[PDB]
Amino acid sequence: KRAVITGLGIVSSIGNNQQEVLASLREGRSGITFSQELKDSGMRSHVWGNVKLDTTGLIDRKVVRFMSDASIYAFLSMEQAIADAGLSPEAYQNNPRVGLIAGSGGGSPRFQVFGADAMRGPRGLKAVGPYVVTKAMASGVSACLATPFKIHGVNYSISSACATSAHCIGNAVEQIQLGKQDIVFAGGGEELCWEMACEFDAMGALSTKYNDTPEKASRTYDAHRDGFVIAGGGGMVVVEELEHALARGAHIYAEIVGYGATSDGADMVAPSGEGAVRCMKMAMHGVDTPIDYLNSHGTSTPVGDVKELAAIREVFGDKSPAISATKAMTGHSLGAAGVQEAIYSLLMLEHGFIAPSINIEELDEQAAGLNIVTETTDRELTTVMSNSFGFGGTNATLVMRKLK
Amino acid sequence: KRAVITGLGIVSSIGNNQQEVLASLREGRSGITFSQELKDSGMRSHVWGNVKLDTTGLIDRKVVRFMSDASIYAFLSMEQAIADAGLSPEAYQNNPRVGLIAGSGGGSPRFQVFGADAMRGPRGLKAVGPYVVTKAMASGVSACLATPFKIHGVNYSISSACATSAHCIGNAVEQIQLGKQDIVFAGGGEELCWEMACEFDAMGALSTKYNDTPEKASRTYDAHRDGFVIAGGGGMVVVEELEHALARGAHIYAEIVGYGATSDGADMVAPSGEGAVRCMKMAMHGVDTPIDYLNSHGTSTPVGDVKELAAIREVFGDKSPAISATKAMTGHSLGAAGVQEAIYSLLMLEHGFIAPSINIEELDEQAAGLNIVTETTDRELTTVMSNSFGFGGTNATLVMRKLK
Amino acid sequence: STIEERVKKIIGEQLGVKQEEVTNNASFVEDLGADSLDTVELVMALEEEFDTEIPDEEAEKITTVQAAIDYINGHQA
Amino acid sequence: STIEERVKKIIGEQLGVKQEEVTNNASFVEDLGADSLDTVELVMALEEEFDTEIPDEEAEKITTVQAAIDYINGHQA
Ligand code: NA
Ligand code: NA
């Protein structure tokens, strides 16, 4: 009934594996670049957190034919997690005790518009192709991955906006907790395209007044934050039952000692804080050790960061933990943010440092009195927490602690 | 902890409430009509299971502005489920013990195309609007419903192709079993449009021969089937902890005594049967009662109906239950199929009858030996089972039994 | 109707409030219960009614009804 | 280049096989490992490289490599 993380895999804007990520994290390296695609589409935001990798040919033809970018990123991330966990094919394939729970925030808007343009084109149905469904559907990530990896256990996608892959992890923990699975791969992926980004721009949610300086467009907790920078990528962690991981001598990053999942039920687009307070308290219940580091949701938005800060204050009071918003470096990978920021927290827990919250040239007045780390700091971490909030008032909180 | 279905609501192709649905279930009425919109797009399938309902004015403006049709169907189904459960706002709103797990297959392809045409149109970003994200996101159903109903408990969407709302129900039961929730609203919805149907037509998975005879297109287990008929709609059931339902004197349709969720791990689009075999046996675990009725997946497709039939043989053998494919008259509502078939099964269990599997003119040669029901039959049922299978080889099975 | 009655007609048409509530003094967020997404859609309809173009910096300051009449009374040539 | 070598280029790339493994008598399913959805995508790439429609029917008769090579030249209607 105790769940541990035994394998990591990440393809993000600051690294194509956990080593490259570890280097970017220690150095405060931004992953945000200028996007000619976002400018050509007619958007105001011309910056994004792209994946610096040419995935062309990296996956077998009969597998990638069904995949969008969200499935490609998550497939690459699961391959890393499988090798990092030390799982041989006979150890996890064709195993009813082995499942997979990975989702995306919104499928694949690109291939969805492609099929519509193809359907309305000169060729019509002839130009659509038989693979648009698996790419565009919301469960494309879990479905495109469970088939080649021969997953026999649990298999579905969870969707909850930017809490997506965080809820995947918590749901994977629950499957372990009630004995239904020994291993669940949890994570997610998100494509990066104008078809998806321009719809956030139409709401005024994207950073638009830093296109000439992309590496400081995402500036969480800075007084002059303009909105979030959209990002893509994927991530996958190996959630395993404790004694099952001990019996096979696996490497154990941390134990999932807490998982919160609540809802605001108030507003659709702006958080309320009350839900996040319950979500954090829910994830800290029964955790005897204090929280050393908190990877906040911090999205570099005017209203988003102050509400979570108020929630952090009410939860911890005066004994506020070390806070850092990695989204200032990575951007917002939406559906993939929960798993990626859990991986960042695990790297910080495993290697004993705290990644900095960059681009804070002027700390927001509503952030004083907190321990917001702005310079890379070596520190022996024992318990870390990561928040993930999504549209509709949905909240997710993960607490991870070192073993023994 | 034991979970029971305490209320239900449905907007189906065969009725806009459980009364109308029951009238079509006992009668074997087809919900499938000719579709002109499917012609004008250039499809080969001119046949769908549409919702016959004028939804104008049924939802507040400040609430429906965020919703696609999938969210609209699920909202109207959740309104019915709340009233049918006898719940007032003071018992389920602003309650951390009350959650909502409802998803769809792929958000809203229609509004994704709308935003792209608007972005590439004359006005560009000015024409997109700020409401396309909540309509296009994969968790639009759970997001657009959690805010108006003031949900404070768990809140996210599960997506797993045509097993979507079935997994949503099983996850709700898991939430009650863990003791984290007293009530979870579970269900889902699906919009019905050419932008989403034409992609199943490019796969050759839709019925295209019986366009001039729409009520005969969906013909599960018939030797002349042509593929499934796409449908839309929504459903919602009130999953509640037993003692909580007994303490307030709720009406209890049945108890969720089994839940199966497996994966084939073999083929991306064609089922293998081995996974369905493990999925049905996982749900029958601890069920002392024989299965009296089985609501098969029954997609009226050439390959899927045979593999599920062989799976049913391998689990029962001689003690086969009465089998009916409701999709023969309702069609395939995809993301909402799971909760709708669970409701159909609940109505049969509640009113002691079995709905027929219609249009079986020449029975399939591989049916042989399985008591298919082709005419309505009154029968005292106590235990009922419903199967739901999705792309990527993902399976979901529910077992519902009358209480006491 | 006139330019002000047209302006007063379209906001209440989009804000679910009656024409007696949309006062020249009233603001969208405080008195009329509108959020940020409501004001965005309100600008869009204002561009359709008068067939005009409203920059985002000009649409930032139309925080009240009087600011909406003042802008329409100066962009129509 | 010749017509035949252009359809073999399509089959080899769409199915992921070496060019000289695409013999004329090779079956798409039995020899080239193609499934259902590979067939639909295969007839699409023929319409893109060349400039003819293959109104179904023919598409279902094309089970081998030679069947495609015959219909890319022995038709054009
Ligand atoms: Na976080
Ligand atoms: Na069923």
Residue numbers in the entry:
A (entry chain A), B (entry chain B): 2 to 405
C (entry chain D), D (entry chain C): 1 to 77
Reported in the publication:
In these pathways, β-ketoacyl ACP synthases, alternatively ketosynthases (KSs), catalyze carbon–carbon formation via a precisely choreographed decarboxylative Claisen-like condensation to produce a β-ketoacyl species. The small, 4-α-helical acyl carrier protein (ACP) is used to shuttle substrates and intermediates to each catalytic domain or discrete enzyme in these pathways. Here, we use this well-characterized system to better understand ACP·KS PPIs and KS substrate discrimination by structurally characterizing E. coli elongating KSs, FabB (KASI family KS), and FabF (KASII family KS), as substrate/intermediate complexes with ACP that approximate states formed during catalysis. Specifically, we propose that the elongating KSs employ two conserved active site loops that open and close through a double drawbridge-like gating mechanism in order to regulate substrate processing.
In addition, C12AcpP–FabB crystals diffracted to 1.55 Å and C16AcpP–FabB diffracted to 2.50 Å. The C12AcpP–FabB and C16AcpP–FabB ASUs both contain the functional FabB dimer crosslinked to two AcpP molecules. Additional analysis for the C12AcpP–FabF and C16AcpP–FabB structures can be found in Supplementary Notes 1 and 2. In FabF, individual ACP monomers, AcpP1 and AcpP2, bury surface areas of 671.2 Å2 and 675.4 Å2, respectively, while in FabB, AcpP1, and AcpP2 bury surface areas of 597.5 Å2 and 607.4 Å2, respectively. In addition, the differences in contact areas of AcpP–FabF and AcpP–FabB interfaces are consistent with the differing orientations that the AcpPs adopt relative to their KS partners. It is also worth noting that when comparing the interfaces of these AcpP–KS complexes, AcpP’s helix I forms more extensive contacts with FabF than FabB, while FabB forms more hydrophobic interactions at region 3.
